[PDB]
Design a protein around this ligand. Structure first.
Ligand SMILES: *[C@@H]1O[C@H](CO)[C@@H](O[C@@H]2O[C@H](CO)[C@@H](O[C@@H]3O[C@H](CO)[C@@H](O)[C@H](O)[C@@H]3O)[C@H](O)[C@H]2NC(C)=O)[C@H](O)[C@H]1NC(C)=O
Ligand SMILES: *[C@@H]1O[C@H](CO)[C@@H](O)[C@H](O)[C@H]1NC(C)=O
Ligand SMILES: *[C@@H]1O[C@H](CO)[C@@H](O)[C@H](O)[C@H]1NC(C)=O
Ligand SMILES: *[C@@H]1O[C@H](CO)[C@@H](O)[C@H](O)[C@H]1NC(C)=O
Ligand SMILES: CC(=O)OCC[N+](C)(C)C
Ligand SMILES: CC(=O)OCC[N+](C)(C)C
Ligand SMILES: [Ca+2]
Lengths: 218, 334, 218, 228, 238
């Protein structure tokens, strides 16, 4: 099975900036007929993949001319001259030369902009959470960019890492900024035992972690 | 029946009967003439063709006279040589049973215009010419209707399934028994003494004969990858084991021709192959003392070669017997 | 040309499911049908292919034995059967039309979603969240409406009749222990929050549940 | 690439009465219909695309050509041709482990050469008699026959060396070093009267070629593995 | 390279009624389906007129000469190289020692292989007596010399297995084949004094057979090289 590798895994480029995805083959995918069968697919979120290029260079009927492909042997690349918001998505390689036919790793294309500071917040468990017999401590890290974000919980000075809930949101459109909603769940006996709950936020925009904590004893 | 090309050639009479409303008369007005023979090219006929034709003609081409009756009935029974395609299953060759079909139907008239009726369930065999190679187990026509992407209407057809069974005496005698006789000699190379200088001759002859027989079988069966004939599998496994026997014979001959001037016998080799293995194989070496050291060790190398031969004589007999029954017994049991 | 796939399916572990792909507007029997798996995480994996005209089929080694292809010529539909379903088989499956060495995968199915789990149709457990008592009040304050303990997906969390279309961050649902949980956050001025009324209109079509509960100030 | 080959057989349809100025051939669909196809059992249908072809420099030429891309099912020829060939080829190196006293080296190597030549001729009778390319199986067989001829020559030389005695031949010092001290150490032999010294020299010579043939016949999978 | 012609002309109308014009001298190949076995070097039609005893008038005709050249790779691989491999073993029987007991096996196998290949070729070429293929001549001469080698090998084997109890070595045999010929052949017998007369003479007979083998190893090498070069080299030069 020919292995197809795509680099970079991520390619942040601003609007109107030329983009270039590279794509490598474990072995030459040339064919006798004089053509090498490489295809490029774009899959926007929540949609089926759409064909863009086939046979390295040929453009599928109905795609903007800004797309262009080229390569040979085991080296192929896809170039987007002037990117646009509708170009956002994941681009996949596909070799149709040697059976079986395989897909590429994928290259998530995003748009870069001026870095935005995170907006950290912490909310203690609600009353109904206490009634149900649990704890829902939630930390909201909204509108932070780039993805250089880390979350660590130090409960009364002790770093807890087991049972950590990690959840991230894809890039937005109105502001094109990421967000994070990592939380942690605790039992009532394990919730009332401790006193201090803290949620740090490490980001490039602020090297020093942002502190947002509340004390159970109030 | 062409197994290699997967074609069946039959000589049949296509018996057809329909009604023409214009070819009617009252015999009382024509001197009590109740029927006449007219050329079939003067009248309308249905366009019944053989769908699965291969290397022949789709439609009837002889066009004999049609028997026309006073009430409009027309009987047309032309002959026809048909070369149809049928998939050939050679799993149990030469004990194989084939199932070759012939699909008949009108080409341009749908069910709403021409409909087919089974005159009789079974293909008529009263005037059949027995072949001496196949026997017709069953030959039944089945009425089918189905829709094609060509056309919006339903087209009926009658498919005849000729289940024919081969008589296996000829190929038994001419392929199976010679193969068994040649395979019987597979294990004799392990009883041949290494001093005879003929082990290689025997095993090589066996391998070449088996290869020739495999090619002969290949010249008969079709080149299909759906099934492997049991005879083909048996021959291939026999060739694999004969090649292994040739390798083992080369090794045994190398062992037999060793002397202190060229080889040194490891103490563990002496222990195993002169104490343990000979005892387990019920072969007892005489207790003899030879003054000469070179001759004594030269005789020990000869015995080690005998023991190795005896090990594989048992193993190959077991494998040959288990492999044979483990391949052919289940198919025989239904 | 159009490829129509069956609806979403939910099955218990160890069961088997049979997805279908119906093609219309072309010679169905003359085009290979490629089956592609896409786990929610990432990646496009090709399960295999079938040519409806004949019975020919191919399988990628990873899926050999797991998936079986069958085709019905009468009704232009192609079927894939997944055996011994497990958690990792939960993904979105696509069917595409392919002709090797020629016209590529230009048309795709809508994608069939398959989820493998033993849970039942649990309604939502929305827990509206209000700012903590020990928290400073700033010019801009972000609200929070948590939803958890619901199954199966999806749940359409929104505001009252699209009260706040912008500034909404609906985080992806995640499996805490066995049921899905999500979160949301909307930025609103502290001046209009006491006056303006907005409530998270949580929804659950699978359970036919429509419950909304706003957050009260602390 | 036989028997793992894929064939591209075309069907060109024209009107041999009317040219482009009189009729226009048009494709109803871009592929050939398989709605009532009977699978072959030896060949696999891969693609049957149709194309309408014009001639820019003729203006009176039109045709519709279908390409039948068919892929062979290789189990039958694998079992019946490739496994026997590999079995026979595996015997090409045994002649160098066979003792010269057995008096059967010639039988073995000649039999191997005969079998390989027969298989080559059968393969030739199967494929078309065209000179554009050689089957990889044919090339591998041919390489093996060249090797087996080399092995026959070497075995003749080794047999001649084996049956040498002081009464007929004298061992030059260069031999008494190269083949009795140096090379045996290289090949891990470790020799434990003179007539037997000649026998050992033969034993060393064919042990050396056993190594050479193993490397050549193990790197000979680089010429076989590339086929499938 | 073959030169196959095709003669065309009207059957019943003479030149005064129907006359043929060469549409184009060269045969058209624009829609030629390449075969993979032959190539058309030249295909030109020539207009001829000639009289037949049948009839008093002149009948024109256009004769096309198809000069076609065979692509030799297929038959090279399938016949030529195997024949060369079998021919390489023709002289090996003279280097085999007589104690190996396999000279006859080798030479007989070579003879039978060459004969089978000659028969295989005979099924391809036409049975015409005007020309003899060079491959056929080479094969026939190789079979003749291999038969001669079999005869010489039988004689040498008979010479090797002689002993004082059955044969007496003439003085001239000893002189020639133990002093003169071994010197000319650059083979030097070790000076060994064996006390046993019977075992010594048996060694003399064994050595005499080796000398006779070495004589014909040189002769057959010379003949094989000179014959091959003297048969194929001139044709390769123009
Ligand atoms: C099977 O054999 C046929 C006939 O040799 C092959 O058709 C040929 O395919 C090549 C490659 O696509 C065609 O060349 C290309 O043509 C396009 C369209 O005109 C042009 O834009 C490209 O620049 C290139 O020249 C060629 O025209 C075509 N010939 C014919 C007569 O159709 C076919 O590719 C083979 N298929 C396989 C799978 O082997
Ligand atoms: C007419 O012929 C039929 C036989 O074909 C016969 O049975 C019948 O009696 C005849 N009728 C008359 C009136 O001759
Ligand atoms: C023979 O084939 C026909 C149609 O393929 C089928 O209906 C019938 O059962 C078959 N009979 C046997 C004995 O296999
Ligand atoms: C071929 O034959 C024709 C007629 O005999 C002759 O005119 C022509 O010169 C020949 N060409 C060659 C190359 O032999
Ligand atoms: C209308 C016509 O000629 O149909 C031919 C094909 N058939 C027999 C499948 C309908
Ligand atoms: C007149 C006539 O029939 O002539 C036939 C023979 N030919 C072609 C040599 C003139
Ligand atoms: Ca037959």
């Amino acid at each position: 099975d020919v292995l197809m590798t795509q680099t970079p895994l991520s390619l942040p480029v601003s609007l109107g900036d030329q983009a270039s995805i590279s794509c490598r083959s474990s072995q030459s995918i040339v064919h006798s007929n004089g053509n090498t069968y490489l295809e490029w697919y774009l899959q926007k979120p929540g949609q089926s993949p759409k064909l863009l290029i086939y046979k390295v260079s040929n453009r599928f009927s109905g795609v903007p001319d800004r797309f262009s492909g080229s390569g040979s042997g085991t080296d192929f690349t896809l170039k987007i001259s002037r990117v646009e918001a509708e170009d956002l998505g994941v681009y996949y390689c596909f070799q149709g030369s040697h059976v079986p036919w395989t897909f590429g790793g994928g290259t998530k294309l995003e748009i870069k902009r001026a870095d935005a500071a995170p907006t950290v917040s912490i909310f203690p468990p609600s009353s109904e959470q206490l009634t149900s017999g649990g704890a829902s401590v939630v930390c909201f890290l909204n509108n932070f960019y780039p993805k250089d974000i880390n979350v660590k919980w130090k409960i009364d000075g002790s770093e807890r890492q087991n049972g950590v809930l990690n959840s991230w949101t894809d890039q937005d459109s109105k502001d094109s900024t990421y967000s994070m909603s990592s939380t942690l769940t605790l039992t009532k006996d394990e919730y009332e035992r401790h006193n201090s709950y803290t949620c740090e936020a490490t980001h490039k925009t602020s090297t020093s972690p942002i502190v947002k904590s509340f004390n159970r004893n109030e | 029946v062409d197994e290699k090309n997967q074609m069946m050639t039959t000589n049949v009479w296509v018996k057809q009967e329909w009604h023409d409303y214009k070819l009617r008369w009252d015999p009382a007005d024509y001197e009590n003439v109740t029927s006449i023979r007219i050329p079939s090219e003067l009248i309308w006929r249905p366009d019944i063709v053989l769908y699965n034709n291969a290397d022949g003609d789709f439609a009837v081409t002889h066009l004999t006279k049609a028997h026309l009756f006073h009430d409009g009935r027309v009987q047309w029974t032309p002959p026809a040589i048909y070369k149809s395609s049928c998939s050939i299953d050679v799993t149990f060759f030469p004990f194989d049973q084939q199932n070759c079909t012939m699909k008949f139907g009108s080409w341009t008239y749908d069910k709403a215009k021409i409909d087919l009726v089974n005159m009789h369930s079974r293909v008529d065999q009263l005037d059949f010419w027995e072949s001496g190679e196949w026997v017709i187990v069953d030959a039944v026509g089945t009425y089918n209707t189905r829709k094609y992407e060509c056309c919006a209407e339903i087209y009926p057809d009658i498919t005849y399934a000729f289940v024919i069974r081969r008589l296996p005496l000829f190929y038994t005698i001419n392929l199976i028994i010679p193969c068994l006789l040649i395979s019987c000699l597979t294990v004799l190379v392990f009883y041949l003494p290494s001093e005879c200088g003929e082990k290689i001759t025997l095993c090589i002859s066996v391998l070449l004969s088996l290869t020739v027989f495999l090619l002969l079988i290949t010249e008969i069966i079709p080149s299909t990858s759906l099934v492997i004939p049991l005879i083909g599998e048996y021959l291939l496994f026999t060739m694999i084991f004969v090649t292994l026997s040739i390798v083992i014979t080369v090794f045994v001959l190398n062992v037999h021709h060793r002397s202190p001037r060229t080889h040194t016998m490891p103490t563990w080799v002496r222990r195993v192959f002169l104490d343990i293995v000979p005892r387990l194989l019920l072969m007892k070496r005489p207790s003899v003392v030879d003054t000469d050291f070179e001759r004594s060790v030269k005789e020990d190398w000869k015995y080690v070669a005998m023991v190795i031969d005896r090990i594989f004589l048992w193993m190959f007999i077991i494998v040959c017997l288990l492999g044979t029954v483990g391949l052919f017994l289940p198919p025989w049991l239904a | 040309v159009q490829l129509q796939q069956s609806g979403a399916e939910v099955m218990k572990p160890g069961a088997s499911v049979k997805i279908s792909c119906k093609g219309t507007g072309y010679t169905f029997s003359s085009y290979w049908i490629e089956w592609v798996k896409q786990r929610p995480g990432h990646g496009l994996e090709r399960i295999g292919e079938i040519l409806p005209g004949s019975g020919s089929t191919n399988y990628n080694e990873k899926f050999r034995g797991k998936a079986t292809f069958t085709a019905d010529k009468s009704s232009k539909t192609a079927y894939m059967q997944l055996s011994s379903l497990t958690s990792e088989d939960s993904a979105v499956y696509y069917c595409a039309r392919y002709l090797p060495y020629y016209y590529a995968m230009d048309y795709w199915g809508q994608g069939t979603s398959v989820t493998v789990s033993s849970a039942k149709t649990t309604p939502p457990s929305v827990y509206p969240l209000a700012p903590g008592s020990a928290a400073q009040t700033n010019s801009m304050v972000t609200l929070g409406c948590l939803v958890k303990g619901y199954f199966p997906e999806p749940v359409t969390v929104t505001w009252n009749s699209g009260s706040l279309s912008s500034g909404v961050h609906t985080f992806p649902a995640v499996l805490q222990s066995d049921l899905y949980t999500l979160s949301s956050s909307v930025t609103v001025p502290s001046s209009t929050w006491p006056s303006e009324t907005v409530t998270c209109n949580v929804a659950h079509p699978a359970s036919s549940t429509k419950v909304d509960k706003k957050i009260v100030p602390r | 690439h036989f028997p793992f080959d894929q064939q591209n057989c075309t069907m060109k349809f024209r009107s041999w009465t009317y040219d482009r100025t009189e009729i226009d051939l048009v494709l109803k669909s871009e592929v050939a219909s398989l709605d009532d196809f009977t699978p072959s059992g030896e060949w696999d249908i891969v693609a049957l695309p149709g194309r309408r072809n014009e001639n820019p420099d003729d203006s009176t030429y039109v045709d519709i050509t279908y390409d039948f891309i068919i892929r062979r099912k290789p189990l039958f020829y694998t079992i019946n041709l490739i496994i026997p060939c590999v079995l026979i080829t595996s015997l090409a190196i045994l002649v160098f482990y066979l003792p010269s006293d057995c008096g059967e080296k010639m039988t073995l190597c000649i039999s191997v050469l005969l079998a390989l030549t027969v298989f080559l001729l059968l393969i030739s009778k199967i494929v078309p008699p065209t000179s554009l390319d050689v089957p990889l199986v044919g090339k591998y067989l041919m390489f093996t026959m060249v090797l087996v001829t080399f092995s026959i020559v070497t075995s003749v030389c080794v047999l001649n060396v084996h049956h040498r005695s002081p009464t007929t031949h004298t061992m030059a010092p260069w031999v008494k070093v190269v083949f009795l001290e140096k090379l045996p150490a290289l090949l891990f032999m470790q020799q434990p009267s003179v007539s037997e010294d000649w026998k050992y020299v033969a034993m060393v010579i064919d042990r050396l070629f056993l190594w050479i043939f193993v490397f050549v016949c193990v790197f000979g999978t680089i010429g076989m593995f590339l086929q499938p």
